[PDB]
Amino acid sequence: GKQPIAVPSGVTVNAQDGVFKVKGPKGELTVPYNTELTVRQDGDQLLVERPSDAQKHRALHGLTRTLVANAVKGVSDGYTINLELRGVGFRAKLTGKALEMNIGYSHPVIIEPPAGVTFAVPEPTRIDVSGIDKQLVGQVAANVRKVRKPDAYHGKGVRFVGEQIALKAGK
Amino acid sequence: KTYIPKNDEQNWVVVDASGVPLGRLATLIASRIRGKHRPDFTPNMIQGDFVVVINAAQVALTGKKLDDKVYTRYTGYQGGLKTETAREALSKHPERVIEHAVFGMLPKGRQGRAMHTRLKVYAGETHPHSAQKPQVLKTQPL
Amino acid sequence: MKGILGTKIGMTQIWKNDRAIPVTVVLAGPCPIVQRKTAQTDGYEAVQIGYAPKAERKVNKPMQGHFAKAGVAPTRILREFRGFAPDGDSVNVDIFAEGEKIDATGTSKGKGTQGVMKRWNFAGGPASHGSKKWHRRPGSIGQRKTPGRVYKGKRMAGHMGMERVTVQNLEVVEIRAGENLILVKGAIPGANGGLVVLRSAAKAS
């Protein structure tokens, strides 16, 4: 189970209604939150309690908390995912903002970053997906990776840096 | 002997269907239409009131129904029996859901058919019958 | 959008570069504006124009009033084209360039009440294998006690033709402009001295 909420000193999670909204320094947000359980600040910290305790109540508990959590750690720290391209010469860049994936496909695949998120390159065989949301960035890197899931033979594809991949091996 | 009346009046109302289960508003309106709330009630006369429904767009249907609720319109033609989700028909043409409901709840003979006409079906909060001065009916069980 | 009206004049053989293209000649003598319908006026987005001219005498009163509402002189024929606009009055120059694919609509040549063959391409019957009085007849209409009916729309003898037919992606070989003559690749349905409407293609490719 879970309760403790650690807010920094430049937050403002205006806990009105059920639409418990935030406006952190790393760009403000708007976050859709459960009404029938209620949550607010109690000084320097903050808390999300729950009414009844059958079982279905016990979900939107740890759910909603970890969600507002995601908001906090997002408007403060921000978010980021490291991606790497492995395989016979795979490469990506930047069309202003669009992701220039060149992944051993007869005709190139380029992607367009929705709002809130932004793209990033270091050495071209790596992509850094960063933005204010933590859902959305997940919901984007998901796609980028899903341009070519690392195959089960050489492990050639797109992956989360450290990520181990197991390798069947063939003939 | 018993008192057979004479159909003056022609009385009008506004059912706001915003946020009400279908079946319920369905019988409320079906009843106001049939006439049954008229103590001078009469079975071969269509005494009933005129019903103006607003916001048939914003009716309440209890989940998951609008992703389960089929509507089957057979066409004479093989491969006719076409379908439609409740949300489909709702975004398409919502007054044809409300119409469809109220119409199962009214007699299927010469009368009932004719009664259908006493239904005026809309969406949002707008009707062109401001000339008929409809009395804003409510939502209760009385 | 793109559209105009004219007559089916004839099928003929002509050459571009080296090949026998077969071309049907349409005419699209100037069409005049007559009615310009917009949403706030008539709900939907269109324009009514007109083809073959007509002398004031053989003309109705109402139709006269109409044609006079925008000083036009009567056309024996009216028609609408959805989502147009122009400015002035409407010929084929400014409307087609040579080579542009186009959708050409006419009425067919109709054939009267027609056989199961001619109409719908039925099989037939063994013209000599004992086959009493069954040479041209479509055989069976159904099954049996189930369903016990005959299907809706079951093809069978019927008036064939005089349908409204559209043929798709046709190519403007040639524009004899200001002779309002149009050359078009291939077929176009419905008889010579025909009434046809050349509209832009429906599609893209």
Partner: protein, 58 residues
């Protein structure tokens, strides 16, 4: 007769069953044909019979 009475009752706040029951309770032994008649041709009378039935009910 029945549906007309049901109507009547409901026209104020009563059920048919409750009206008719409080009109069994105060022993007001009226035929229901008559009750229809009262109900649809005679307003304030139906009113009173109502107030009665309800009184005797509680």
């Amino acid at each position: 007769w029945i549906q007309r009475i049901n109507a009547g009752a409901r026209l104020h706040g009563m059920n048919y069953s409750t009206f008719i029951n409080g009109l069994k309770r105060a022993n007001i032994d009226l035929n229901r044909k008559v009750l229809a008649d009262i109900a649809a041709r005679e307003p304030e009378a139906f009113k009173a019979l109502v107030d009665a039935s309800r009184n005797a009910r509680q």
